[PDB]
Design a protein around this ligand. Structure first.
Ligand SMILES: Nc1ncnc2c1ncn2[C@@H]1O[C@H](COP(=O)(O)OP(=O)(O)OP(=O)(O)O)[C@@H](O)[C@H]1O
Lengths: 277, 1340, 251, 50
DNA sequence: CACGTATGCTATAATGTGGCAGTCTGACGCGG
DNA sequence: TCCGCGTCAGACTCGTAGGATTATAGCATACGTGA
């Protein structure tokens, strides 16, 4: 029989009212006053009109089935707010809604990285300005050439052209040969390999030895300040909370701990060796 | 002979004089794209076709319409020079004139209401170079010609769909250029079916009903008629004697007076002539005979008016008696025969569930659009739209041509749509083949495989641009206001531009030109593929396609194709092969007129080759006459045998037409197995050009042809004397005869100097001519990177010796002397391009300054203040080429770093580091640096110093242009002035600016002075705008990607030397890795002392069966022997007469040498410049199959005072004692393949990690570990080695705990197993849970 | 995740997920409106199309094609066949302490020996240099040992040379047919980017010196050093397991 | 072919003798690439059960 | 209040969809 | 049970190179969090 979701729905609309001028008014007048059945009909009837409106709004964001569904929601909001008393027809008023609801729902579900309407709205005018220029310049317009025709900022144009880039999927094959995708190449940022993991472990274990090689009162105000042994990274003035309670003596003893430690790095074989790093 | 030829002549062992000279090898690419841009007035081709096809476009209402007028190409925005550098398409503006015409609605057709007309841009088309390349984003790229099934009709049969029945089911299929497919096919019960688009299977009479055909007409078309007369009482029947042929007499066959055949007897040819000569027309028959026969037309009772029996119904005794008494004693029935005229349509109609025309269009509609309720128009519109509308369907010219000649038709040229006739004619020949007459076509014949070059494909992709515009035009026209809306507001320029760049980029045929060798460029442009879109696939590819087909002869090369799964599909074009005007291939052939082999040549199509018998080029001509022998070995009908003289109709022109370019360069190919010949020609393309171009001593002659036609060299447009020689450029003065009278006549050739290749190798053009040398028109002025005096120079020749050496030449392993390495002769050049990008991050913009945090003064030593390394500065891995810094944001300075930055200090600025530094391992010399900046942010001071040079160098370069152009322009006027008013010095007193002031008498030459005077001014005014274009494009800010602010591109220059691991080979597929560079002390050497260069393994020869290399060696030695004799006489400083006698004795030796070069014609000076180039070795040409034989080579060896054998007395260098017995020594022209070991070796301990799999990455490109696949795994399972595997599953790969933990344990010394469980499995758990499946790890 | 080029990249699952959530939320909206059933039907058919496309795209009907006219990779696809997790990212793995290079002949070597380039074994045995360095007291920490190696100073070659002695390395050639497709040897450091292999075991690999490459692997654990010397050593592997016949035979 | 190749590699092949040699050469090397997957797939099949 | 993001409304009549795929092959089940 | 239509497989490592197009109107009223 028929097993395409497309042709099935398109069949069910093909057996639904095709209303006259005075018919539309009869149903619509009852639809506003809530006849229930009336709101169902006007909608059922004009599903055929939504499809012909979604025949031109395809290949832009979603599929044909997706456009129709959204387009139907526009016909419904048109039915929620139609004026039968007015001598003007319905098919005219409903078209304004069905063209709007489609464009708007395409603006959201077209791009992966969600873009609000405001940054998008503006982008359109920048792009539609590029059309005019391109045809007469016969050269795809620059960020400047667009800025000189609108007389608007340079970074704005460039800032609006930075949110119109495409996104290559991670699982996309590479060079007319699905040998490897981008995931088999693209690196992991977070975790650096053992060599970088053991760097910090060995460097920070060497410091634990250098802190036990200094004076007891020299490694008590030096680490408790930087937050090496203590719990919170304090300042020269804040070391007074512990037992130091000093401002001058804290600053002299902090630097006295660092001066004896600078000679511990000159003798072990670092100093200028570990200065590049 | 010419001057550039006089410098060095190649001894040709050809004996088959070239009647056809090798054509320009790059014919297809250039001629194809020429058609595409060519604005043909009527005969639409390329763009002109694309517009007339789609246009005129009219609105959906049909009140407004857009009409195509004319188009044009503007000159390129950026020329090739610039395009290659900047990095954007070398394209031309497309300006097309459109006309918007609108009609009156209530009025008939008010065509003259508003005829709006304007010109509109849409898309920029990449142009083709003179090399047949497209510059896409600064890359010369090549579009390979495609090979696809030619449209029209084709008859096939699956030799056993159901081997159950094992019945050969025959089928036909109409293949259009555009449109739906139309197939006809039989079935186990021989019922004809039709399957449009191979969709549903529908009875084949349903399509005929759709063409308005009643049951009667159908039968009347296919089947013949059998007449039955019921006279008085005796039933009678018309007999054509030729009908009851090969059948059995089921009844007693008797006539006006005679019984011919008895019941149950076979009617032979005797009985048929017995009846036919007796002139038998009528025979009385029994009524039992009709029971089974099918009635033809309808038969209504004259009386009642009802159908007694409908058409196509098997008769019976009672039906016949009902018809005899109705009043019909003239009955028509079908001529059914199970053997010849088969009853198929008849049995098919019994299956056919349709009725009339309108009902036949229903099931056709219910097939393709199932579910939609059918109307009169929807059913009719569909079927009419399929194969019967000017829109949907198009067979094309080739389609209709092949379609017609497949049906043995009347027309070559006809309609693009299928007519009723066409369909039934196709069903008819399908049924002919089913009967017995007619043979099926096969796809492998090149008569069915059409070639589609770029220009036709560029046309196709340009149509989709127009088709995608058609949509936007119609919809905007109808609902949009008529007046206000302009035609360019409805046009979009992006869909065309995007659809064309889709082709020039993403397509499988658009690929980066392989230009690591002149041979690679020319053979890669002459590549022809069956793959990509509208072709075949490795997944889909069979065998018989790949297999060499006897049509390939002269058209396609049998030995030119990758040995990769894309083996038989990809193929190079033959040497003298060319495209048929329609699409097929064609090969040159010498016509034989009345026995006389005439010099008139005819390019025979793939179709007509089969017709005539074709003699081979091995056949001997009688010096203007005919074949010397009465019997001639020839070939035809795709087979080979001997024939008589008068029977020969055509003959192979040359002996090299079977092979390609790749194969025409292999000498003694005749003595080489096709398997090794293929590999040899495949590796010859991979031959990286060497430092010093060395000519091949053992060539074929095709050498020069390749080097010249490749477009890598610079050949003279006009002959004359080289006024000026230079490393950068060449200036040549033209002779009077060739020089035009208008212009000055001084050609300019700015030679391409050292710059990059697509394979990262050297590209140079050195002048091969001396200052002030007389040069003939079409002579090579500058040599390329792999060319020498115009001849191709791919690799280098050297003294080789075939013998084992302590296993250093084990399996084809190579033992090369240090002396080769000392001459740096196989040392190669590699220009590597690296870039530094200043981006715009979220935090802020990046810049390029010398100010870099965490750095040594040692690193910023080679940089300047701007932050770019000096030109000529040596660099090594770790040194920084270009200083870059990016913004540093909220950065958590770890306590241990805040303390370390507080101790030693250097509170690094809020600006991150990412300077471009030489990649770890590379080291070269910077030869140039180029800076690209957006039109905006102020520049680096170095970027200003480079602008200084470009400008002041361009001001000089243009000053030099107008200066020398002035001198050549007044040089003419000076000669014109003497003719008439003859005065020498008195005219040359005052300066030359007041020479246009002087004139002549009323004469042609007075008009000439006015031409040169106002052309001097034309150049004087032209010089300013030439300066403007240069100045602006230097001041112009180069457009970049969004986010990028400026870029700095560096060019390094690496000199890699040969070393163990480097791969080299001959041209006979003899491969090998260099194992050891032997000391000069250790190299074997002859009694005389000179050592050997390479020592090859003799065992890489018998098994290989590529004896061509040995012949290359022997001839090379002989050739060198002659050079060694000439070298000695030139060193001894002997005489011109002595060299003349010996060299004349050398050129003339072969049996019938093709070239007969007399040296009495050569002047003394011309002989000594020749001998000076002959001393390295007399270059020899061995045509592919007409090469030199033993008799000639051994005779040459006697001239060189070399051994007849070719084996020399060798002595071991290590020791000094002789080897036990002689070894073959000679000069083999070997090559240095691109597969160099510096570009291969890799190592990894720990590095990057994958993104989700959390195993290491892949390749030395990204620094990745080698893959240990499942096969590699089972090996350790077999050993039993359990940890070695678990170690390679966890700590070496995923196990995040393991890898870091194990590292720390190794540095501790404790190499301890510490597993956990790879990440990639923990992924697989959640991935199956995401699929809605409870997969948990059940514990102990 | 974002590219270095300011671009982003997303897996096709995210895209397939947005098709499911959008249609599911639109159904919530239409059930709020009490819309006619004919529309609710389409929405439910759509929802199922999206769900089925998320689990296994190419199965029920046409697989939902995306940007480059290719089909979106679904869930099932990452568990399915070669390109699935099992065969590609679980039984087969890229491995650390691994390098490959053009091999060349080693006619001077004994059976239990193989040429290994210096700069190869350098990078391969990186954690073993840092380890032996802290022992001698030449490196105080590991980033100190890192720089010692980087500068390629003379005395670092002699330490690298120390650890490698009495240390086997695995040599693999593709394809790995039988177990002998990997054999272990005692590395001999050689100046040059070429690996030097023993002629007699060339038969097992089917390794022709016509431009072959062999993967190297370092056995880290002491058990792996014992396994390599005991089972996978070239001297302990003579006869083929297929036939009781010597595969180590001159040619 | 009814008529085989008379000559050898020392004597040299004529133009067809080579064209004839091609037919056998390319099909022999086609089965080196394509037929290998059935035999390597057998190795896979055997292993899993064993 | 404001900047960024969202929801909203407009009225001639208009009311059933539709660019490629190229066919691969030998094997083994699963509804009519 | 035969026909037919569907689903499932189809060697292992290495390489090269990056990557693409489109289009959703002007305007005002509105809802949400920091100052
Ligand atoms: N596609 C491929 N996959 C795997 N191995 C291949 C492939 N193509 C070629 N080879 C291998 O490359 C080698 C090419 O032939 P090779 O020169 O090694 O022959 P051989 O076995 O040494 O015999 P001979 O001594 O007669 O030349 C073979 O070992 C072959 O298995």
């Amino acid at each position: 029989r028929v097993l395409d979701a497309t042709q099935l729905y398109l069949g069910e609309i093909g057996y639904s009212p095709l209303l006259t001028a005075e018919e539309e008014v009869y149903f619509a007048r009852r639809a506003l006053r809530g006849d229930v059945a009336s709101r169902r009909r006007m909608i059922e009837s004009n599903l055929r009109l939504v499809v012909k409106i979604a025949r031109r709004y395809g290949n832009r964001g979603l599929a044909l089935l997706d456009l129709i569904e959204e387009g139907n929601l526009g016909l419904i909001r048109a039915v929620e707010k139609f004026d039968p008393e007015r001598g003007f027809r319905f098919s005219t008023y409903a078209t304004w809604w069905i063209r709007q609801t489609i464009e708007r729902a395409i603006m959201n579900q077209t791009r992966t990285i969600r873009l609000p309407i405001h940054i998008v709205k503006e982008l359109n005018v920048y792009l539609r300005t590029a059309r005019e220029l391109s045809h007469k310049l016969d050269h795809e317009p620059s960020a400047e050439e667009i800025a000189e025709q609108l007389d608007k900022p340079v970074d704005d144009v460039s800032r609006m052209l930075r949110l119109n880039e495409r996104i290559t999927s991670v699982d996309t094959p590479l060079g007319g040969d699905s040998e490897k995708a981008l995931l088999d190449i693209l690196a992991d940022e977070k975790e650096n390999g053992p060599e970088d993991t053991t760097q910090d472990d060995d460097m920070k274990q060497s410091i634990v030895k250098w802190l036990f090689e200094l004076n007891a009162k020299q490694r008590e105000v030096l680490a408790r300040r930087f937050g090496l042994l203590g719990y919170e990274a304090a300042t020269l003035e804040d070391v007074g909370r512990e037992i130091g309670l000093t401002r001058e003596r804290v600053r002299q003893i902090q630097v006295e701990g660092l001066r004896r430690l600078r000679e511990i790095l000159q003798t072990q074989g670092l100093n200028i060796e570990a200065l590049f790093l | 002979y010419s001057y550039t030829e006089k410098k060095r002549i190649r001894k040709d062992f050809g004996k088959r004089p070239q009647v056809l000279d090798v054509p320009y090898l790059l014919s297809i690419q250039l001629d194809s794209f020429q058609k595409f841009i060519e604005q043909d007035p009527e005969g639409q081709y390329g763009l002109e076709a694309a517009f007339r096809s789609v246009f005129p476009i009219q609105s959906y209402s049909g009140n407004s319409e857009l009409q195509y007028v004319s188009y044009r190409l503007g000159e390129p925005v950026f020329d090739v020079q610039e395009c290659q550098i900047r990095g954007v398409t070398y394209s031309a503006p497309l300006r097309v004139k459109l006309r918007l015409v609108i009609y009156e609605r209530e009025a008939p057709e008010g065509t003259v209401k508003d005829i709006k007309e304007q010109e509109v841009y849409m898309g920029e088309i990449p142009l083709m170079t003179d090399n047949g390349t497209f510059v896409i984003n600064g890359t010369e790229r090549v579009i390979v010609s495609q090979l696809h099934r030619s449209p029209g009709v084709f008859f096939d049969s699956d030799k056993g769909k159901t081997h159950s029945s094992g019945k050969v089911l025959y089928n036909a299929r109409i293949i259009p250029y555009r449109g739906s497919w139309l197939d006809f096919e039989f079935d186990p019960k021989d019922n004809l079916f039709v399957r449009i688009d191979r969709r549903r299977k529908l009875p084949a009479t349903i399509i005929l009903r759709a063409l308005n055909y009643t049951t009667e007409q159908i039968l009347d078309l296919f089947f013949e008629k059998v007449i039955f007369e019921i006279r008085d009482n005796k039933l009678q029947m018309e007999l054509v004697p030729e009908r009851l042929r090969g059948e059995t007499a089921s009844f007693d066959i008797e006539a006006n007076g005679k019984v011919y055949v008895e019941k149950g007897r076979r009617i032979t040819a005797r009985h048929i002539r017995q009846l036919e000569k007796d002139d038998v027309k009528l025979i009385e028959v029994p009524v039992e005979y009709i029971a089974g026969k099918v009635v033809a037309k309808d038969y209504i009772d004259e009386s009642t008016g009802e159908l007694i029996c409908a058409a196509n119904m098997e008769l019976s005794l009672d039906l016949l008696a009902k018809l005899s008494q109705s009043g019909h004693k003239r009955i028509e029935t079908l001529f059914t025969n199970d053997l010849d005229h088969g009853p198929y349509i008849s049995e098919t109609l019994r299956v056919d569930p349709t009725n009339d025309r309108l009902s036949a269009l229903v099931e056709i509609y219910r097939m393709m659009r199932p579910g939609e309720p059918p109307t009169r128009e929807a059913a009719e519109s569909l079927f009419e739209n399929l194969f019967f509308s000017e829109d949907r369907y198009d067979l094309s010219a080739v389609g209709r041509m092949k379609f017609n000649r497949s049906l043995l038709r009347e027309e070559i040229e006809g309609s693009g749509i299928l007519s009723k006739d066409d369909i039934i004619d196709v069903m008819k020949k399908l049924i002919d083949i089913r009967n017995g007459k007619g043979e099926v076509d096969d796809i492998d014949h090149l008569g069915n495989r059409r070639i589609r070059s770029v220009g036709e494909m560029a046309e196709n992709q340009f149509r989709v641009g127009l088709v995608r515009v058609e949509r936007a035009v119609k919809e905007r026209l109808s609902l949009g206001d008529l007046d206000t809306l302009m035609p360019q507001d409805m046009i979009n320029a992006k869909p065309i531009s995007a659809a064309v760049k889709e082709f020039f980029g993403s397509s499988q045929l658009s690929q980066f030109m392989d230009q690591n060798n002149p041979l690679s460029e020319i053979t890669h442009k002459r590549r022809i593929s069956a793959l990509g879109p509208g072709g075949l696939t490795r997944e889909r590819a069979g065998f018989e396609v790949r297999d060499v087909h006897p049509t390939h002869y002269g058209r396609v090369c049998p030995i030119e194709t990758p040995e990769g799964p894309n083996i038989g599909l990809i193929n190079s074009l033959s040497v003298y092969a060319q495209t048929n005007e329609y699409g097929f291939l064609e090969t040159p052939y010498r016509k034989v007129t009345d026995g006389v082999v005439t010099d008139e040549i005819h390019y025979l199509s793939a179709i007509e080759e089969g017709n005539y018998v074709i003699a081979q080029a091995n056949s001997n001509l009688d010096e203007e006459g005919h074949f010397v022998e009465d019997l001639v070995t020839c070939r035809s009908k795709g087979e080979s045998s001997l024939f008589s003289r008068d029977q020969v109709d055509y003959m192979d022109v040359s002996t090299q037409q079977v092979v390609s370019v790749g194969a025409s360069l292999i000498p003694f190919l005749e003595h080489d197995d096709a398997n090794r010949a293929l590999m040899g020609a495949n590796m010859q393309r991979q031959a990286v050009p060497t430092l010093r171009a060395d000519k091949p001593l053992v060539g074929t002659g095709m050498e020069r042809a390749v080097a010249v036609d490749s477009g890598v060299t610079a050949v003279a447009k006009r002959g004359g004397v080289v006024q000026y020689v230079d490393a950068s450029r060449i200036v040549i003065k033209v002779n009077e005869d060739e020089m035009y009278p208008g212009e000055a006549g001084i050609d300019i050739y700015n030679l391409t100097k050292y710059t990059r290749s697509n394979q990262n190798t050297c590209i140079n053009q050195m002048p091969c001519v001396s200052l002030g040398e007389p040069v003939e028109r079409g002579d090579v002025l500058a040599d390329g990177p792999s060319t020498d005096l115009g001849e191709l120079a791919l690799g280098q020749n050297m003294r080789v010796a075939f013998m084992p050496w302590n296993g250093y030449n084990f399996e084809d392993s190579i033992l090369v002397s240090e002396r080769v390495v000392q001459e740096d002769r196989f040392t190669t050049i590699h220009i590597q391009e690296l870039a530094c990008v200043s981006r715009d991050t979220k935090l802020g913009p990046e810049e390029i300054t010398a100010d870099i945090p965490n750095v040594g003064e040692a690193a910023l030593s080679k940089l300047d203040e701007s932050g770019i390394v000096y030109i000529g500065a040596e660099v090594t891995g770790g040194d920084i080429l270009v200083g870059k810094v990016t913004p540093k944001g909220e950065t958590q300075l770890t306590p241990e770093e805040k303390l370390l930055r507080a101790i030693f200090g250097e509170k690094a600025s809020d600006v991150k580091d990412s300077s471009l530094r030489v990649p770890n391992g590379v080291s070269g010399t910077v030869i140039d640096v180029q800076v690209f900046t957006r039109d905006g942010v102020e520049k680096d001071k170095r970027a200003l110093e480079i602008e200084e040079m470009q400008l002041k160098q361009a001001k000089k370069d243009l000053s030099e242009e107008l200066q020398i152009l002035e001198a050549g322009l007044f040089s003419r006027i000076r000669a014109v002035l003497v003719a008439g008013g003859v005065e020498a010095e008195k005219l040359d007193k005052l300066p030359r600016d007041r020479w246009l002031e002087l004139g002549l008498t009323d004469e042609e030459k007075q008009n000439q002075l006015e031409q040169l005077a106002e052309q001097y001014d034309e150049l004087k005014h032209e010089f300013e705008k030439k300066l403007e274009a240069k100045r602006r494009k230097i001041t112009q800010g180069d457009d970049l990607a969004p986010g990028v602010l400026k870029i700095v591109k560096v060019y390094l220059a690496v000199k890699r030397r040969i070393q163990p691991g480097d791969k080299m080979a001959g041209r006979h597929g003899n491969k090998g890795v260099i194992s050891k560079i032997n000391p000069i002390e250790d190299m074997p050497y002859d009694e005389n002392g000179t050592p050997v260069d390479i020592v090859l393994n003799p065992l890489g020869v018998p098994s290989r069966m590529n004896i061509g290399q040995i012949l290359e060696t022997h001839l090379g030695m002989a050739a060198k022997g002659i050079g060694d004799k000439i070298n000695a006489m030139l060193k001894q400083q002997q005489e011109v007469a002595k060299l003349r006698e010996f060299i004349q004795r050398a050129y003339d030796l072969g049996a019938d040498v093709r070239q007969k070069v007399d040296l009495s014609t050569f002047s003394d000076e011309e002989v000594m410049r020749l001998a000076e180039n002959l001393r390295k070795g007399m270059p020899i040409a061995t045509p592919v199959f007409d090469g030199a034989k033993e008799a000639e080579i051994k005779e040459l060896l006697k001239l060189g005072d070399l051994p007849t054998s070719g084996q020399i007395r060798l002595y071991d260098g290590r020791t000094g004692e002789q080897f036990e017995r002689p070894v073959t020594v000679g000069y083999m022209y070997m090559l240095k393949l691109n597969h160099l070991v510096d570009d291969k070796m890799h190592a990894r301990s720990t590095g990057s990690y994958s993104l989700v799999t959390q195993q290491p990455l892949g390749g030395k490109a990204q620094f990745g570990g080698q893959r240990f696949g499942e096969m590699e795994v089972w090996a350790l399972e077999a050993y039993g080695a359990a940890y070695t595997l678990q170690e390679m599953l966890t700590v070496k790969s995923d196990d995040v705990n393991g890898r870091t933990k194990m590292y720390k344990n190794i540095v501790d010394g404790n190499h301890q197993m510490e597993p956990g469980m790879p990440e990639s499995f923990n992924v697989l758990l959640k991935e199956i849970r995401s699929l809605g499946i409870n997969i948990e790890l059940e514990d102990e | 995740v974002p590219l270095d080029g300011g671009r982003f990249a997303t897996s096709d699952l995210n895209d397939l997920y947005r098709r499911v959530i959008n249609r599911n939320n639109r159904l919530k909206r239409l059930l709020d409106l009490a819309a006619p059933d004919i529309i609710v039907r389409n929405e439910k058919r759509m929802l199922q199309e999206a769900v089925d496309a998320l689990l296994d795209n190419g199965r029920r009907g046409r697989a939902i094609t995306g940007s480059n006219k290719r089909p979106l990779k679904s869930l099932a696809d990452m568990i399915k066949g070669k390109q699935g997790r099992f065969r590609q990212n679980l039984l087969g793995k890229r491995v650390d302490y691994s390098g490959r290079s053009v091999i060349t002949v080693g006619p001077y070597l004994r059976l239990h020996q193989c040429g290994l380039p210096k700069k190869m074994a350098l990078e391969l045995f990186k954690p073993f240099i840092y380890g032996k360095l802290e022992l001698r007291g030449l490196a105080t920490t590991i980033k100190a040992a890192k720089k010692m190696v980087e500068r390629e100073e003379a005395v670092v070659w002699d330490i690298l040379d120390e650890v490698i002695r009495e240390h086997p390395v695995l040599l693999n050639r593709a394809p790995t047919l039988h177990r002998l497709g990997i054999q272990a040897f005692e590395p001999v450091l050689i100046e040059g980017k070429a690996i030097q292999l023993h002629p007699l075991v060339c038969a097992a690999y089917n390794a022709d010196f016509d431009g072959d490459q062999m993967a190297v692997h370092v056995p880290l654990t002491l058990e792996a050093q014992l396994e390599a010397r005991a089972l996978m050593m070239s001297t302990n592997n003579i006869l083929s397991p297929a036939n009781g016949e010597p595969i180590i035979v001159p040619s | 072919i009814e008529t085989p190749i008379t000559a050898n590699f020392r004597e040299g092949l004529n133009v067809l003798q080579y064209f004839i040699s091609t037919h056998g050469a390319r099909k022999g090397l086609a089965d080196t690439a394509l037929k290998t997957a059935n035999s390597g797939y057998l190795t896979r099949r055997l292993v899993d059960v064993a």
